[PDB]
Design a protein around this ligand. Structure first.
Ligand SMILES: CCN1CCN(Cc2ccc(Nc3ncc(F)c(-c4cc(F)c5nc(C)n(C(C)C)c5c4)n3)nc2)CC1
Length: 368
């Protein structure tokens, strides 16, 4: 389906104005709710039977989300639902700009920590509501986080993809289910995955926002887990033993000096798959603590700088806790909202610092 100007529904009717996206997910288009001054986004799903319950499940969760009022929990609001030419449509409120196109706007300049904080706090409260209902987003990525109104509401945001969401009843992963740069280790190796899958995605997102570039811009799933263990340490023996896909990226060295597992050398991969592995990280780290020493020229002197050095110490502290290789030990939405970095406890230790007075003024301004 596709058209340039026309549509209708049960109580409402919509005209299309411009295209907003088109791909495997279907087709999203921006429309005008005639009779009012609302512009809405409505997403059409393709009308093929093999994709039947893939659409039935997205509506089933959208309904379970309108009830329980996910709205005002920093989620996009789903207005109504209907059909048109046998296709199925979903009406959403219109948001302005997603974080990818926002980073691209500043030529991928790093965003300062003072701005990153309110965004995280909101995306955390949105995931917190998910866990309390038992849902997994599964596609949390920069493209799926948007500024309500980046000019009239400088920092409010909301989430906006559900084509990958599912209940926690699943305990098995058959194929890929995230955007690669943000796919959690559970998906890459093949283990029973939980809602932590998204908390990983949030790790690469806030990391991407601070560095200005993907933390792990792997070209293939191999490159991905290569960058990960190379930075954070090789995964744990118990994880790799029960992973289905772990034979594809790791080898079981039974050498005299073996803990049971070693990563496959590049040469072993290029000889196996035939694909030369190009380095893709704009940033290469030996440790995650190493992240605190990046983009270090600040134009701040005096107390302003010491506060910034303490803000970074607590940033890596949380990033490490969000990016635990293990799924269970990884920090949970409720616990991140309590971590000192979102809390800002460590900032109180700094009286009359004009950099700290401006950090608090960003959290308080988030409510308005
Ligand atoms: C070539 C660039 N052109 C011009 C720039 N433009 C950027 C852009 C993107 C989105 C919006 N507005 C908006 N508001 C509310 C919504 F709910 C969705 C929404 C809902 C869904 F279910 C989706 N499922 C998927 C896969 N998407 C993707 C489209 C993210 C969904 C999006 N989108 N405004 C501008 C892109 C096209």
């Amino acid at each position: 389906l596709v058209q340039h100007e026309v549509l209708c529904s049960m109580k409402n009717t919509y005209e299309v104005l411009d295209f907003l996206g088109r791909g495997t997910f279907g087709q999203v288009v921006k429309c005008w709710k005639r009779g009012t001054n609302e512009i809405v986004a409505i997403k059409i799903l393709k009308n093929h039977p093999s994709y039947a319950r893939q659409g039935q499940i997205e509506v089933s969760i959208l309904a379970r989300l309108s009830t329980e009022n996910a709205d005002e929990y920093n989620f996009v609001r789903a207005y109504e639902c209907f059909q048109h030419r046998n296709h199925t449509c979903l009406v959403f409120e219109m948001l302005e700009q997603n974080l990818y196109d926002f980073l691209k706007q500043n030529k991928f300049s790093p965003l300062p920590l003072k701005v990153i904080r309110p965004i995280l706090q909101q995306v955390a409260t949105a995931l917190k509501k998910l866990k309390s209902l038992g849902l997994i987003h599964a596609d949390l990525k920069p493209e799926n986080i948007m500024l309500v109104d980046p000019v009239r509401q400088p920092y409010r945001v909301k989430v906006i993809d559900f084509g990958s969401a599912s209940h926690v009843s699943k305990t098995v992963c058959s194929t890929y289910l995230q955007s690669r740069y943000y796919r959690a280790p559970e998906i890459i190796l093949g283990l029973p995955f939980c809602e932590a899958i998204d908390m990983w995605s949030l790790g690469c997102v806030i990391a991407e926002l601070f560095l200005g570039w993907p933390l792990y811009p792997g070209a293939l799933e191999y490159d991905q887990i290569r960058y990960i263990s190379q930075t954070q340490g090789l995964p744990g023996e118990q994880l790799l033993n029960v992973g289905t896909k772990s034979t594809r990226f790791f080898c079981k060295e039974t050498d005299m000096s073996h803990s049971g597992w070693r990563l496959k050398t590049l040469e072993e991969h290029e000889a196996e798959t035939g694909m030369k592995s190009k380095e893709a990280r704009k940033y290469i780290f030996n440790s995650l603590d190493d992240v605190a020493h990046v983009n270090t020229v600040m134009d701040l002197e005096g107390s302003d700088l010491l506060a910034e050095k303490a803000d970074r110490r607590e940033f890596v502290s949380l990033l490490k806790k969000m990016l635990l290789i293990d799924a269970d030990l990884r920090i949970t939405p409720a616990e991140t909202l309590n971590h000192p970095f979102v809390n800002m406890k460590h900032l109180l230790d700094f009286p009359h610092s004009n950099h700290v007075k401006s950090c608090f003024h960003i959290m308080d301004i988030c409510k308005s």
